[PDB]
C-alpha cells in the first residue's frame, strides 16, 4: 500500500537472509554490553 | 548454445506470433435492441453496447488507484476486442431487377414488433426495405460491395481503421516487404520463397497481413541501458557453431624443429597438449574477435598456478600477430598491451650475442631500440590505440560504406587486413601469395634479430592465418548483419569511450582468459560447418517485438495524463501504480526481454517518461487499433463513471386511466435520468470534513431533512461512482427505491461516542415499465400518499429512447463494405518464417 | 476511519490522572540513564525488519 | 586502504612518495592523483560518506521540542524515493565520485566496475535508513540535540 516498496524492477529482490525485532536486538545489545565488560573485569586484578 | 531461459522466452515469442485477433463473420455484431410496450406504434429502442459494457469490471474507491488502473485497460481491451472482425461472405436475395440486403445483416433487430404491426406500418417497413440496395464498389482494381447498416459510433471508430489499415496493406505495404527481405535474402545468402503468392487463383484473392516487415531499427535501440541484452540475444539467435582444425604437423616439425640437437621455447611449446579450460579459453578469445568493441579481453593469473617464460614470451610475439586493437576500433584494454609490449622486449633480449649490434634507446620505455644492419627502430611497434601500431588493423582499411544495406542501424562493412568479404573461400588454395604491411614489418624485425626458425614457421602458416580471418570475415559480414548490432554513432563512440575513461555509454563487457591460450588459438581454426536454426524467423521476431514494446508505448504515454483529469480520486498514486498495472497486463515474454538487461543496471520513472517522448512507433494493427481505442476512450462518460448524481425527493407518477385504449396506445414509462443537470442554486456540494462537523454537531440528520424539505440537490463527494442499467415490469424493490446514498453509524465504547460517515460508492440506473388491464378502474393506481423516489442521475448519451413505427430504421447511416461470396482470404503473416540457408562450398 | 465525535452523554463522568504533552528535561535529567533511554527507544521504536 | 592502493599484481605504475612517514603520503598514477586527501580528520570529516555534504539539517517544527533534527546520510533525502531528481547514471555523491576516480586512476577496473555497479543499492540502503532515523524513532527518548551536539 505505501509506494515505497512497491517494486517493478528485478535488481533489489533476492532470498531473505534474516529477520529482526525490537526486543531480541535490544536483549542481544544489553548482553554484549555485560559480556564486554564482565570481560573486562575478569581479564585483570 | 543458448541458456536454455531465453530459447524458452524466443519459442514463447514466436508463439505469440502466431495468433489472429481480427475475425471474419457473415452478418456484424447486434448494436441495437427493441423492446415492445403495450404500445402498437412505439417502442424502446435500446443501443446494447452500453448496457454490455455496464455489467463489466468491479467496483472502486479511490483507496486502489492501480486497481482503478487494471480496470480501465480492462476496459479499453474490451472495445479493442469487440470490433475486430471483418465481414464476408454476406447473404442477400434479389428482387425488382436489384439486389436486396437482409434484415438481419441490417445489424439491428425489429422482429418482436411485427404482428403487433398494422397495414400501413408493415407496408411503410416493406417499401423501405425494399429502398435498401448494394453498390458494386472498387478497392485496388477489385470487385467489393457497399451497403447500408447501424454500429454505434465507438465500434464504428475501429472498424473504419481496420478497413483503412486493410486497404493500405493491399496497396503498397506487401511489395516493398517482398523487395527487402529479397534484398536481405542476397545480402545474407539465405533463399526464400513466393510460392503461395503465385497459384492459378492468385488473381482475385485478398491477403492480410498482421506485421509489416520493416521493423524501424531505432524502436529496438531506443530502449535504454539494453546494449547488454542486445548483445546477449544477438549472440543467442544467431551465433553459429562449427568445428576446430590443425594444420599439417609436417610444418612445425620441419620450422621450429629443423634441428634436432637443439630446441627452442617454440619447439617446447610446439609438444604441448590441450586441457578442457585451454578451449574454453579459445573459444572466449574468437567470440570476443567476433564482436569488437563490446567483448575486451583481459588476463587472469590463477593463484595455484605458475607461468613460464618460454610460455610468456611466446605468447606476446604469437600475440602481437593474433590482435587488432588499433586504429578506429579496439580490442584490450591498455593493460593488455602493456604485458604483451613487455614480453616482446623479453622476447628480444634472450639470445643477444655479438653478430647482432643493438643501439639502446635512452628512455625508460621497454621496447626502445635499434636491430639490424640497417639499424631499423623498433620504437614503432609500441601498442597506441591513436595510431594502432602493434596490431593487424595498423595501416589498413577496416571500416568502409559500400552500398546501401538492407538494415539502415547498420551499415558497416568490416574487412580485416585488406581482404574483402564478397569472395567465396577456398580454403585448401586461398590465401597463398598476399600480403599486409604489418606482417610483413613483423617478419623484417624478426630476421633482424636473427631468429631464423620463427620466421619460416610464420611464413609457412601465412595461409593458415588467412584462411582463419577469411572464415572471420565471413562470419562476420554474413550472418551477424541484423538490428541487434550496435549502432553506427555508438560503434564510432567505442574508442573515446575507451581512452577517455568515462561511462556516458554502455560499458563494453570484458572477458578474461590465460596466457598459454593464445598459442592455441592460433593454432586452432574455426569453421562454421553448420549454421544456427532460428536465423530464417528474424524478421518475424522484430515485427512482433516492436509492436508490444509500441503497445507499452502508447500505454505510458496516454496513462501518464490520468491525474491530471481526474485529480480527486487519484489524489495519493503515483506513475509507479500504472507501471505496475501494465506490467500485470502484459505478456510474460517481453517482461523477461528487459529483466536480462534492467536486472543489471537500475531504472527510474524519468527513464520510463523521456522513454515515452522518443517518437519512435512500428507501424503494425494491433498499434492502429489501440491507437483509435484510446482515442475512442477520451469520454470517460462513455465508460459507466460519473458524478452527476443527486438524492432528491420526487414522486411517481400515477396517471388517471380515464381512457385504456388511447393511453395504451402511447407507451408511457418512468426513469429517473435526469436530462440535465439543475442550477447551481438547488445544489450544495457536500465532502467527508463538512459531513464530520455536521456529525460533531449532533445536527447532521436534521439538517439533511430540513433541506429535503427544502426541495433541493445534494452532490455527495465528487468521487466518480459505479453505474448500472435495470429494467423492469413491475414495482423495483424498497432498498434501491428509498435508499440512502451514504451510511451513518454511532456507537459508544468506553464512555466516549463514536461515529463514522461513508458516502455510497455504487449507485444503478433504472427504467419502469407500467402495464395496464382492460378491466381496470380509472384511478387503480390512485393513493392517498403517492411515493418517493430518490435518485436522480443524469447523462448526455441518449441511451434509451422511445420511438415511433417509421422513426425506428433512422439509425441506418453507417456505411459498411463487404467482399464477394466467391472471393477467398489467407494469412500470409507466418509465411514469413520459411527459408532456407545456403551452406558455404568447403573442403 | 472511525472518526470522535465530542458528543457529552447526560449521565456519564469523565476522570483523568495525565497531562499528555511532556517535558523531555525530567526524563533527560536522570543521573547515568542515557543507556538506559537508549535501549528501552530500541525497545520501543524498532519495528519489525529483515 | 594505503595497503590496498599500495599493493598490485599488473605491472608496475610509479609512485612518488611524501614527506613523512603518515599513511597515504604520496602520488600516484599518470594524472598524478593526490590520495592525501583521503586521510581521517574529525574536525574536516574528509574520506567518509559524511564527507562534502551536509549530514543533519533543521525544518518546520517537530511534535517533541528537544531534538528538531532531521539526518541527511550522503546527502540523499527520502523524498528521492517518491520523487527522485536525478536519472541512473546521474546518481552520485562527492566521496564515491573521488573513490572511483581514485580507483580508475591505480589503473584498477573491475572492481570500479563491481562498485559502479553496486552504487544504487548502497543509496537506497541509506535512503531506507533515512526513513527509520528521520520517522520511525522520533520519541521522548532519541538524543537531545543540545548533547548530540556537545
Keep these: 500500500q505505501r509506494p515505497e516498496r512497491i517494486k517493478t524492477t528485478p535488481y533489489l529482490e533476492g532470498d531473505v537472509l534474516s529477520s529482526d525485532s525490537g526486543p531480541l536486538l535490544s536483549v542481544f545489545a544489553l548482553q554484549e554490553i555485560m559480556q564486554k565488560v564482565r570481560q573486562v573485569q575478569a581479564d585483570y586484578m | ?843
Excluded at chain 2, 527513464?607 to 494491433?622: A, E, G, I, N, T
Excluded at chain 2, 460517515?757 to 390512485?782: C, G, H, Q, R
Design chain 2, 1 to 843: 548454445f543458448t541458456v536454455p531461459d531465453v530459447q524458452k522466452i524466443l519459442d514463447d515469442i514466436k508463439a505469440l506470433a502466431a495468433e489472429q485477433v481480427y475475425k471474419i463473420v457473415k452478418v456484424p455484431s447486434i448494436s441495437f435492441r427493441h423492446i415492445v410496450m403495450q404500445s402498437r406504434d412505439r417502442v424502446l429502442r435500446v443501443d446494447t453496447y452500453y448496457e454490455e459494457m455496464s455489467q463489466v469490471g468491479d467496483v472502486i474507491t479511490e483507496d486502489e488507484p492501480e486497481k482503478f488502473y487494471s480496470t480501465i485497460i480492462k476496459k479499453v481491451r474490451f472495445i479493442r476486442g469487440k470490433g475486430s472482425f471483418i465481414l464476408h461472405d454476406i447473404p442477400t436475395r434479389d428482387h425488382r431487377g436489384m439486389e436486396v440486403a437482409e434484415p438481419e445483416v441490417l445489424g439491428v433487430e425489429f422482429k418482436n414488433v411485427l404482428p403487433v404491426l398494422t397495414a400501413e406500418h408493415r407496408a411503410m417497413i416493406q417499401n423501405a426495405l425494399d429502398g435498401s440496395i448494394i453498390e458494386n464498389g472498387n478497392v485496388a482494381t477489385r470487385d467489393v460491395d457497399v451497403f447500408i447498416g447501424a454500429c454505434s459510433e465507438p465500434v464504428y471508430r475501429i472498424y473504419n481503421r481496420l478497413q483503412g489499415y486493410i486497404e493500405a496493406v493491399q496497396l503498397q505495404e506487401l511489395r516493398n516487404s517482398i523487395g527487402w527481405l529479397e534484398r536481405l535474402g542476397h545480402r545474407k545468402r539465405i533463399t526464400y520463397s513466393q510460392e503461395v503468392l503465385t497459384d492459378f487463383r492468385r488473381q482475385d484473392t485478398i491477403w492480410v497481413l498482421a506485421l509489416q516487415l520493416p521493423v524501424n531499427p531505432q524502436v529496438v535501440w531506443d530502449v535504454p541501458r539494453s546494449s547488454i541484452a542486445n548483445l546477449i540475444m544477438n549472440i543467442a539467435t544467431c551465433l553459429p557453431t562449427g568445428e576446430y582444425i590443425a594444420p599439417n604437423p609436417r610444418i612445425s616439425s620441419i620450422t621450429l624443429t629443423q634441428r634436432i640437437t637443439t630446441t627452442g621455447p617454440f619447439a617446447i611449446l610446439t609438444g604441448s597438449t590441450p586441457t578442457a579450460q585451454q578451449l574454453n579459453d579459445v573459444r572466449k578469445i574468437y567470440l570476443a574477435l567476433m564482436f569488437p568493441g563490446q567483448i575486451i579481453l583481459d588476463l587472469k593469473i590463477d593463484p595455484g598456478e605458475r607461468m613460464d617464460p618460454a610460455v610468456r614470451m611466446v605468447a606476446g610475439v604469437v600475440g602481437h600477430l593474433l590482435f587488432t586493437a588499433g586504429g578506429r576500433f579496439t580490442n584490450l584494454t591498455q593493460n593488455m598491451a602493456r604485458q604483451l609490449d613487455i614480453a616482446l622486449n623479453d622476447y628480444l633480449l634472450y639470445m643477444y650475442n655479438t653478430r647482432v649490434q643493438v643501439n639502446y634507446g635512452p628512455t625508460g620505455e621497454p621496447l626502445d631500440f635499434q636491430i639490424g644492419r640497417n639499424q631499423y627502430d623498433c620504437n614503432v611497434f609500441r601498442a597506441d590505440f591513436a595510431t594502432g601500431t602493434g596490431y593487424n588493423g595498423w595501416a589498413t582499411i577496416d571500416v568502409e560504406y559500400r552500398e546501401p544495406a538492407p538494415y539502415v542501424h547498420a551499415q558497416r562493412y568490416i574487412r580485416y587486413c585488406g581482404i574483402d568479404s564478397r569472395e567465396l573461400i577456398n580454403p585448401t588454395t586461398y590465401g597463398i601469395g598476399m600480403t599486409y604491411h604489418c606482417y610483413n614489418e613483423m617478419l623484417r624485425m624478426l630476421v633482424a634479430a636473427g631468429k631464423d626458425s620463427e620466421a619460416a614457421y610464420f611464413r609457412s602458416m601465412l595461409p593458415f592465418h588467412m584462411v582463419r580471418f577469411a572464415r572471420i570475415n565471413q562470419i562476420i559480414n554474413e550472418d551477424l548483419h541484423s538490428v541487434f548490432s550496435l549502432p553506427d554513432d555508438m560503434f564510432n563512440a567505442l574508442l573515446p569511450d575507451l581512452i577517455a575513461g568515462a561511462h556516458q555509454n554502455a560499458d563494453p563487457v570484458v572477458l578474461d582468459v590465460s596466457w598459454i591460450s593464445l598459442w592455441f588459438a592460433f593454432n586452432r581454426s574455426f569453421e562454421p560447418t553448420h549454421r544456427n536454426e532460428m536465423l530464417e524467423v528474424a524478421p518475424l521476431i522484430e515485427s512482433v517485438y516492436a509492436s508490444e514494446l509500441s503497445v507499452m508505448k502508447v500505454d505510458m504515454r496516454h496513462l501518464s495524463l490520468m491525474q491530471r483529469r481526474f485529480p480527486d480520486v487519484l489524489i495519493q498514486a503515483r506513475p509507479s501504480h500504472f507501471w505496475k498495472a501494465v506490467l500485470n497486463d502484459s505478456p510474460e515474454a517481453v517482461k523477461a526481454v528487459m529483466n536480462l538487461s534492467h536486472s543489471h543496471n537500475f531504472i527510474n520513472i524519468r527513464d520510463m517518461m523521456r522513454w515515452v517522448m522518443l517518437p519512435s512507433l512500428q507501424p503494425s494493427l494491433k498499434l492502429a487499433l489501440e491507437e483509435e481505442a484510446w482515442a475512442a476512450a477520451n469520454d470517460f462518460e462513455d465508460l459507466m463513471l460519473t458524478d452527476q448524481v443527486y438524492m432528491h425527493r420526487d414522486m411517481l407518477p400515477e396517471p388517471r386511466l380515464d381512457d385504456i385504449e388511447r393511453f395504451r396506445q402511447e407507451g408511457f414509462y418512468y426513469t429517473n435520468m435526469l436530462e440535465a443537470p439543475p442550477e447551481i442554486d438547488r445544489v450544495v456540494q457536500y465532502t467527508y470534513e463538512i459531513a464530520r462537523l455536521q456529525a460533531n454537531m449532533g445536527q447532521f440528520r436534521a439538517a439533511l431533512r430540513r433541506i429535503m424539505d427544502d426541495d433541493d440537490w445534494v452532490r455527495f463527494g465528487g468521487v466518480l461512482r459505479t453505474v448500472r442499467v435495470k429494467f423492469y415490469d413491475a414495482r423495483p424493490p424498497d432498498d434501491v427505491l428509498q435508499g440512502l446514498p451514504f451510511s451513518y453509524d454511532t456507537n459508544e465504547r468506553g464512555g466516549l461516542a463514536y461515529a463514522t460517515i461513508k458516502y455510497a460508492t455504487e449507485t444503478t440506473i433504472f427504467y419502469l415499465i407500467y402495464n395496464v388491464e382492460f378491466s381496470n378502474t380509472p384511478d387503480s393506481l390512485v393513493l392517498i400518499n403517492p411515493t418517493y423516489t430518490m435518485t436522480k442521475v443524469f447523462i448526455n448519451k441518449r441511451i434509451v429512447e422511445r420511438v415511433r413505427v417509421g422513426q425506428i430504421l433512422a439509425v441506418l447511416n453507417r456505411r459498411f463494405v463487404a467482399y464477394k461470396g466467391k472471393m477467398r482470404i489467407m494469412d500470409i503473416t507466418q509465411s514469413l518464417k520459411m527459408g532456407t540457408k545456403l551452406a558455404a562450398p568447403t573442403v
